[PDB]
Amino acid sequence: MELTAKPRTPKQKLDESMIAAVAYNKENNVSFALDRKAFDRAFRQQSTTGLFDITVEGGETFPALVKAVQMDKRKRAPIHVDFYMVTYGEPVEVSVPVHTTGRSQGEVQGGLVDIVVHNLQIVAPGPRRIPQELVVDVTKMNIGDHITAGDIKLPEGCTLAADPELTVVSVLP
Amino acid sequence: AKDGPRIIVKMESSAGTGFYYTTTKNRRNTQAKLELKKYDPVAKKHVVFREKK
Amino acid sequence: ATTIRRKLRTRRKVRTTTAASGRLRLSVYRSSKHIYAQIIDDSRGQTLAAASSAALKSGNKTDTAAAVGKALAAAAAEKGIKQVVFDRGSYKYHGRVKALADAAREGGLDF
Amino acid sequence: MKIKLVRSVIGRPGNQVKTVQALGLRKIGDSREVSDTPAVRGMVKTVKHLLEVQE
Amino acid sequence: AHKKGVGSSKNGRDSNPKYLGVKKFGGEVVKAGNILVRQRGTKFKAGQGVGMGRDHTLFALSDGKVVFINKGKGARFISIEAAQTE
Amino acid sequence: TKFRKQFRGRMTGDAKGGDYVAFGDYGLIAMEPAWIKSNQIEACRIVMSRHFRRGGKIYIRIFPDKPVTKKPAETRMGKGKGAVEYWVSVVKPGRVMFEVAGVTEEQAKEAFRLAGHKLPIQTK
RNA sequence: CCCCCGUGCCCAUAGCACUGUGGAACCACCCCACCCCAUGCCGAACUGGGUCGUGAAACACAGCAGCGCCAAUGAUACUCGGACCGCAGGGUCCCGGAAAAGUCGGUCAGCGCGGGGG
RNA sequence: GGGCGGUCGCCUCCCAAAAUGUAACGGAGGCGCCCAAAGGUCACCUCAAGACGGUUGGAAAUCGUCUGUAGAGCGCAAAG
RNA sequence: AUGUCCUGUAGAGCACUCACAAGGCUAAGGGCACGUAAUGUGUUCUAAACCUUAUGAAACUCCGAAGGGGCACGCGUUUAGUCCGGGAGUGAGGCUGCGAGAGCUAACUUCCGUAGCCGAGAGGGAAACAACCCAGACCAUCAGCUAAGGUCCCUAAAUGA
């Protein structure tokens, strides 16, 4: 949970336990690193939920969040991802997930566990933060109800992307 | 290049003292036998051209 | 239709003063107020002076164009005075294209 | 001010070979200096790890 | 000849592209761009076409002739810095 | 069960791909373009549905690519003929993702069945 | 330093929407209509003559993110090249060139250029 | 490979290995024209396409309208 | 070294091409339904498809280069830039790298080009063995070192750390 490191090359980015790391804060670029022990505390319970600190080698203190999740393609060795830090005035990419949880009231006619396989949501968030509080998956899966993406329990404010009408959880047992 | 009144046309102008056949065609849409024209010949100006054989 | 129609002749005009540069340009304006002229030599140029009223003032469309066609066909044509010119012909040809150009060579210009 | 040469031969494409038609030099055992053309400061940097400081 | 199904036995065909003048090279009225065998005048190949572009070139001598309506000819007045004479 | 016609063609080449997505439950990805005989993936879901349940629907992230052209064998010294084989080929994409619980990956246990190569399940 | 018919540079750091305003010199409508011009029909944006009236959306000006639009050396993706893991892909380091989205900002500019004014 | 069949000229490329840049019993569309005018000049007009409801009008053919990286069409593959 | 212009692969990405997944909505859509002047009333589901979520690619788009060519500035090695002619060869190759084509990405099978190699020269390594790591010679010396290969032996070289 410290920092230091420097290497402007993909040397110590492809050597056992490490990563690559990226930073672009207001007058703060460079490509650090850090090990990879309890470096999978992203999508666990810290997904924007709360924001500690870090104590970087030398100056300042930037809280920041997690900046979505990513893990690793196929394997499980998260190749370099990303990392947001609130100190910019206009990027995108928000992490507002939509899960699947419960006993699945699908045995009413025919239907299994809340599927969903995507990894993208209609979201927006002004500044850069991405709070942690939302459901959408439940609400009596049957007919004359449904619960998808279009408004819901929505972060804080409204939404902005292109055309508010994705798909996500839905029902259709 | 074929022969037998069906497709293709075989007409080719005629001009007095303006020796030239015009050497091009089209088709029998328009009248047959008769074939009024005008247009330049050897050079000079335009000459006869009235079609016939 | 003007700021939607007027587009036919613009770059297609400048193609004799820029494809030969041997002929002048020509402003040409509606307004039906004043008349003026204001030309510039060669497509690679667009700056020259002119004048105004302080002559004969009584608004018109027809007999008011042919006027400057000679009334001011050298008053502003300082450079060379005359040196192979071409008319604009933006819009149609009501007669302001006639009575102007047909009163152009009246005083000066070789068209 | 006193220049030398690297240490390699085969295993090098013709691109670097264009350092031969530039600065004529046979073998490696004995290397030498050079004119005064900074526009050559980038005509050896291919396999730099082979030469020395300048001795 | 004669053919049918389940077999085939037909030829194939192309032609010579042959671009010619190779950019920043003297000038004159060479040719270049046989995209269209009929071709046309050009005077001085600026490198036109749809969208912003035009071949960084500038090198007076004579006319040019080039390509089709595809990209673009030139005809520009300008040598490169020269403009007075020769 | 892929295209319906739209002419034959295609060539070869191996590497990886691009079709991995952060899964919502319990993922599963390929790892390079392994071996699945089409008429193997023609026994991918049914084998993953011996009796998982009366009903039940989840999600996959692939689709049959294929044709190959194998030709007889009376005297191989010619051109070609037609596909008559078929194959999927992939990268490290998702293909299962359960949403139940205790079962975990029972149907991602005999998925590796029809899999001469290595295809972990992972999770997300 | 004023408003302002206009020619470029240009080519969405001038697409649209919100407030209001100037009319007398800038610019719109209009008026009269048979005649130059004669509009697929008529003359309405293509017509000959102009002093009411008004500037209402269209003509102008600045404030003006709701999304566009320019948006970075910085990590990735891509790459002339060097030995290698290694199965073709794929991959480590050394190691140059060096996308894009995302980070801020700004967006309704700006300079010469022909004028009707206190 | 014999060879029945299948092949024998030109044109579109895929694969051709970002200048040129080949092959093939590897693959797909055809032809050896048109036109006195889809030729030259000057002029005005943005095309499929949805919506508004109204005709012989159980869609659709009629018209007004905004939208229209214009998605028409420009003589018959194809690229530009 | 440098000036200057482009090709547009690799990829991103998508919005004209072919298709791709989920949600809102779409039935000008269709039929299960006691109707029944369009059916005004009502319903249920893809489906075209707009937005969103956000898919693929040799033959996709306002993106974008390695490299390469064009000439120019200048010299480092040498005739490199520079045609007319007496006369060749014999047209039917192989392999590793670079990628595809017919192809259970199989074949010192077959087509292609690009460096090398053997058709015109030997070795160490490789058990000896055309392209593989190193290296291509004027004839003679039981003179030296480098790279590969090796440091236990049959035939060299520390079972040195």
Q: Residue-wise over C99-108: b if at least 16 C-beta within 10 A, else e?
A: bbbebbeebb
Nucleotide nearest to F8 (CA to C1'): H27
DSSP letter string, E54-81: --S----SS------SSS-----S--SS
Distance E58 CA to G60 C1' (A): 43
User: For residues A93 and A129, what is the distance between their CA atoms, to the nearest angstrom?
Assistant: 11
| Nearest protein residue by Cα to C1' of nucleotide H11 | E13
The DSSP secondary-structure symbol of A128 reads S
Among the listed residues C98, C92, C109, the one whose alpha carbon sits nearest the alpha carbon of residue C41: C109
Rg (CA), chain E: 19
C99 φ, ψ (degrees, to nearest 5)? -65, 80
Give residue numbers, 140 to 169 of A, with CB < 7 Å from strand I: 143-144, 146, 148-150, 161-169
3-state secondary structure of F29: strand
Q: Is the CB of A166 under 7 A from strand G?
A: no
3-state secondary structure of F98: strand
Q: How far is CA A48 from CA A38, A44, E8, in A?
A: 17, 11, 66
Resolution of this model in Å is: 11.5
User: For residues C37 and C72, what is the distance between their CA atoms, to the nearest angstrom?
Assistant: 8
User: Residue ranges of the domains in chain D?
Assistant: 1-55
Ordered alpha helix ranges (H), chain D = 14-17
User: For residues F33 and B50, what is the distance between their CA atoms, to the nearest angstrom?
Assistant: 78
3-state secondary structure of A127: coil
Q: Do F99 and A70 touch (CB under 8 A)?
A: no
| Residues of chain F positioned with their CB less than 8 A from the CB of A75 | 31, 92, 120, 122
Chains A+F touching (3+ CB pairs under 8 Å):
yes
User: For residues A35 and F36, what is the distance between their CA atoms, to the nearest angstrom?
Assistant: 38
Class of domain D1-55: alpha beta
User: For residues F82 and F69, what is the distance between their CA atoms, to the nearest angstrom?
Assistant: 4
Give residue numbers, 73 to 102 of C, with CB < 7 Å from strand G: 91-95
Maximum CA extent, chain A: 62
The DSSP secondary-structure symbol of D9 reads -
Distance from the F18 Cα atom to the nearest Cα atom in chain A, whole angstroms:
9
Protein-contacted positions of strand H (CB under 7 Å):
1, 5-16, 19-30, 33-36, 43-45, 80
Token duo for residue A15: 């050597």
| Geometric angle at alpha carbon A128, from A123 and A129, rounded to 5° | 85
User: For residues E61 and E26, what is the distance between their CA atoms, to the nearest angstrom?
Assistant: 7
The DSSP secondary-structure symbol of D41 reads T
Q: F124 to chain A: nearest residue by CA?
A: A71
Give residue numbers, 8 to 67 of F, with CB < 7 Å from strand G: 13-17, 32-33
The 3-class secondary structure across A20-69, one letter per residue, is: CCCCCECCECCCCCCCCCCCCCCCCCCCCCCCCCCCCCCCCCCCCCCCCC
Among the listed residues A65, A40, A35, A60, the one whose alpha carbon sits nearest the alpha carbon of residue A50: A65
- Kindly give, in sequence order, each residue whose CB lies less than 8 Å from that of residue C111, ignoring residues fewer than 6 positions away: C84, C85, C86, C87, C101, C104, C105
Token duo for residue E49: 């076409």
Q: Is the CB of F17 under 7 A from strand I?
A: yes
Q: How far is CA D2 from the centre of its chain?
A: 13
Is residue F85 a contact partner of residue F67, using CB atoms and an 8 Å limit?
yes
Q: Please name the amino acid found at residue F64.
A: P
User: For residues F119 and F33, what is the distance between their CA atoms, to the nearest angstrom?
Assistant: 10
Q: Do F58 and A69 touch (CB under 8 A)?
A: no
Token duo for residue E44: 């001085």
Q: Please name the amino acid found at residue A114.
A: D
Identify which of F22, F25, F55 has the shortest CB distance to residue A110: F55
Is residue A100 a contact partner of residue F25, using CB atoms and an 8 Å limit?
yes
The A residues from 104 to 163 touching F (CB cutoff 8 Å) are 104, 106, 109-119
Give residue numbers, 2 to 61 of E, with CB < 7 Å from strand G: 52
Say how many CB pairs under 8 Å bridge A and F.
83
User: For residues C99 and C62, what is the distance between their CA atoms, to the nearest angstrom?
Assistant: 7
| Residues of chain A positioned with their CB less than 8 A from the CB of F60 | 117
Distance from the A60 Cα atom to the nearest Cα atom in chain F, whole angstroms:
33
Torsion of CA A124, A129, A130, A132, to 10 degrees: -160
Instruction: Return left, alpha or beta for C37; rule: phi > 0 is left, psi -120 to 50 is alpha, else beta.
Output: alpha
Number of H helices, E strands in chain A: 0, 0
Q: Do A110 and F94 touch (CB under 8 A)?
A: no
| Geometric angle at alpha carbon F58, from F53 and F59, rounded to 5° | 150
Among the listed residues F4, F14, F83, F88, the one whose alpha carbon sits nearest the alpha carbon of residue F44: F88
Q: Do A74 and F91 touch (CB under 8 A)?
A: yes
CB atoms inside a 10 Å sphere around CB C40 = 16
Q: How far is CA C26 from CA A36, C36, C47, in A?
A: 75, 11, 12
Q: Residue-wise over F25-60: b if at least 16 C-beta within 10 A, else e?
A: bbbbbbbbbeebebebbeebeeebeeebbeebebbb
User: For residues A43 and A64, what is the distance between their CA atoms, to the nearest angstrom?
Assistant: 15
- Please give the method by which this entry was determined: X-ray
